């Protein structure tokens, strides 16, 4: 019992308590290509107490739905849609089997005393297979989910899928499943299997060839009914216009050609320092700091790899905050362009403990043999702080090379934490004890207290008075021309504190921008303009070094001020600010800061070291 | 078109490509009680290429399934079941509406050239509603999931649901949903809504009355096909015999009657000390430790409340490791019997800084006025360690009262961490500097290194030699009778290290059991048997105190040696060892250790303080 209907035609009729509508669609497959049937069903109006029930029977599948669809959300609201569409599964073919005959049965029924109205349209899909470097243009809906198929090529072993929306809204979920057919297109079971990502404007998924049996996969797009998870708020139709692009990945030569550059650019400094040095006349407090440094590192190297294993096991790519367009994977690590750029700290913090140790050896030898108290400058024994300076670079580099494996909220902002100490020591600038030893750990304690309290009684307005008092206390000791300069510096610090209180950009995230002014104040106390009535204190090598650290600090602020990701306000809003890669397709735009910060801090420390000349001969 | 069949009868027949089987069941509801229809369908044999498809149509629901069910699991295995059963949703009634007429349509069809065989049985449910303090006896299966209904009483505002299996296997999931009917009984969508727990032998769920609209809820039981998540391994039938019990919760009077006891039991010590004291003759290193103590606490009080909020938001009760039969909730906190028992540390660490400060004041006054160098015992100025002893109790109590909000793996075992320092100081026992200051932080560094390295090259065998060397080094300084005692102690320590290496009970969890021997060695060096040829050094008050700290250390080891939970080997195996509550239905069996450890450590420290008598008059 059937009617023998034909494909691509609009059918209408009346259903009742006894009348049932039967349709039978017969089609022949091919020994190649993929076909995909699609059923669209529309209801006229009303029907909120006696809906229409449609069942579709295949050889190895039965599907069923009611036409007046009713969703449900938070805060006791009810949405109702009146249009249903579905994409039936394919059957596939082989080269050893001929053409296949297939039958689809569609039954429509209702349970109403008077009747209902329905419209049926069953059509084949012409464009079902995505190709390499070809962009599509479809349109989704919260009651019309979509899926497509992709086949791996013979040479490509990895693919990046890029999905781009247009306006802002509504949110969606994208999934990557393997080639079977208990296919999951409903919203409540879309997260059961496969890599899935929430997206509101952008999405990027990285896939490999060795993890898929048969080298074919399904990309599934589903639209969220209520945009609550993405951070926003909130009947007739929603609609969405997406765009999907598949691109290949880089080869293996780039992984060598970039690491060779990033390990052959920091030996020219060694060669230069050697050349400059060997041309002359044509020729236990530290011990009690390692035990504290090995206390504040082991929770990081017990939490980070655990989080990485959790992300690499459960499937959810919503726990870490990477840059999803420039995250190259290697091995267990999923970001191998933010762990090889931190190799500058632990290699440029080793030229201090080859020069200042030689200077210590030479000065102690000169004290042992010659009379070092003749024509000297104010107790020449001055070291012991350079050894606690040139090891904080390594203890900042090792601590920075463990945060970029999973940026999250538990790890907080523990990357620019010891840099506050490295820029706020300001002890060796008081050259030529009681209030310094106590304030050494107290400075880092106050910095950590401010960092913790920045997130949580008018913190912005309360900090201006404390900053002004601290600036006045510092300028009282540092400092009439000197009094006028101290007053101008205190006024500038108060104006900067008032401007920061007026701004209040990103609360705890703005702690870096608020302590950059403190670092500038600490690094603007260069007294090189003392030559009004004093000695010369100027030489070509410190003049070149102060020119270099004046020039090379301007460039290192631009890449700081370009924001790429964000650790606040949902994990689906980081993807909007994502950017691509420059400089040989390996380095990011928040990865040329770890190359300039180290080589500016090293030159500033060298300026601090090599200064106070033209007095050893007096 | 129908046949007019009757309830509770076995029907059989043959289906084909053209023949379809229709059944129509008409039933009348009642103005009270709950009915529940249940459909059982059985297939004879074979049918792996042409299955049987069954659809059930109601007024506001359509359900559909194939009879030769096929599941799927990891490692490319395929299971097939031949029996299906389902429980249809109820329709419910009101007191303002009369009896309701309902019709169920059951259609059976196939797509086979020869035929298939099927058996249908549709029956009503007699026992559908659970009652208070009544235990049921049902039987589940991985292809037969179950659900029941419960209604809140008029006085009870909270309920504990206890589910108990029998043997070990197989695992299951239990869910608590609200009263609607898009009911979720399949395995892939059971975790969409509601509180759910994985269970293999035991489960306990706590529910409240203010969170459920209408005061009715659904308890859903579903059996897992593959027992992989619970930790185990791995066709005809599985089967499971459960048991469910609903019990009420305690009143509000217990929350007052226990806190009054647990704050009125620790003032009798104050009254006793006052009475003993006022009866006589009828009458800056510490400053540099607060800055380090406020460094190792803020990640805990940024991670713990975040984890608690995550558990209290997402629904998953599988991230923290509580005792699910003795976890009383109050407010945001879900365990208010492990945060009010840690109030003993921060209240019994305050009787030292009222007695030793008075002794310091009296001794300084006596030095200022009288000649304190007459008839004294070896430089009577001895304090400065009691002030670093009586504040580690508070810095262990505050650090212990933040781990019991969510025991997990990231928090590790950071509860008995400063107790290693508190028991391994052993500095003031060398009475009457160079190697002590260096070894102070080094002892805690070695303890933290051992704790970290215990989890991860024959650690058990390598530690015996290090322990023997450390024991020999300690006994060389501490210590012929003294040499024989030192040799016997070194031999006993080597035997204990060999026994611990032979045992190796729980690796990193066994670090507490392996350092308990070290604590016993440090607290067994009491030289009170020096009276062979020496002075008396014995008085009634230190004799009573050494008797008390000898007696009250035996009882505090039993409750340690009773294990209640475990932080390793899946989060569904902690529930097997769970126990109930003793001592006025509030305190646990791992909560009478925080009351005896403090009052034994305080008496041991008092023994250390008050000793060396009978020499102030000589």
Author numbering:
A (entry chain A), B (entry chain B): 42 to 275, 286 to 334, 443 to 591, 598 to 621, 626 to 648, 681 to 819
Copy text from the publication:
SID1 (systemic RNA interference-defective protein 1) is a transmembrane protein involved in the inter-cellular transport of small non-coding RNA that cause systemic RNAi. In humans, there are two known systemic RNAi defective transmembrane proteins (SIDTs) - hSIDT1 and hSIDT2 – that are implicated in hepatocellular lipid homeostasis, glucose tolerance, insulin secretion, tumor development, cancer chemoresistance, RNA translocation and degradation during autophagy, and activation of innate immunity. The transporter classification database categorizes SIDTs as α-type channels (TCDB: 1.A.79), belonging to the cholesterol uptake (ChUP) or dsRNA uptake family of transmembrane proteins whose function and stability are regulated by cholesterol. The emerging consensus on the function is that SIDTs are cholesterol-dependent dsRNA transporters with a divalent metal ion dependent lipase activity within the transmembrane region.
Here, we use single particle cryo-electron microscopy (cryo-EM) to determine the structure of heterologously expressed full-length hSIDT1 at ~3.4 Å. As ChUP family members contain CRAC motifs, and are believed to be a cholesterol transporter, we excluded cholesterol and its analogues from our purification buffer to obtain the structure of an apo-hSIDT1. We used HEK293S GnTI− cells for protein expression, excluded CHS during solubilization, and purified the protein in digitonin for final sample vitrification at a sample blotting temperature of 18°C. As a result, our sample is apo hSIDT1 that lacks complex N-glycosylation and is vitrified at higher temperature and pH. hSIDT1 is a dimer where the protomers are related to each other by a 2-fold (C2) rotational symmetry, with the axis of rotation being perpendicular to the plane of the lipid bilayer. Each protomer has an N-terminal β-sheet rich ECD (yellow box) and a C-terminal all α-helical TMD, which can be divided into two parts – the TMD core (blue box) and the lipid binding domain (LBD; gray box). The β-strand-rich ECD adopts a double jelly roll conformation, and two such double jelly rolls, one from each protomer, are juxtaposed in a C2 symmetry to form a dimer. TMs 1–4, along with TMs 10 & 11, form the TMD core of the protein, and TMs 5–9 form the lipid binding domain (LBD). The TMD core is stabilized by four tiers of evolutionarily conserved interactions – the TMD-ECD interface, the TMD disulfides, a metal ion binding site, and a phenylalanine highway. While we observe density coordinated by H563, D574, H791, and H795 in our structure, due to a lack of convincing biochemical evidence, we have not modeled a metal ion at this site in the structure. In SIDT1, we notice a similar phenylalanine highway within the pouch formed by TM1, TM3, TM10, and TM11.
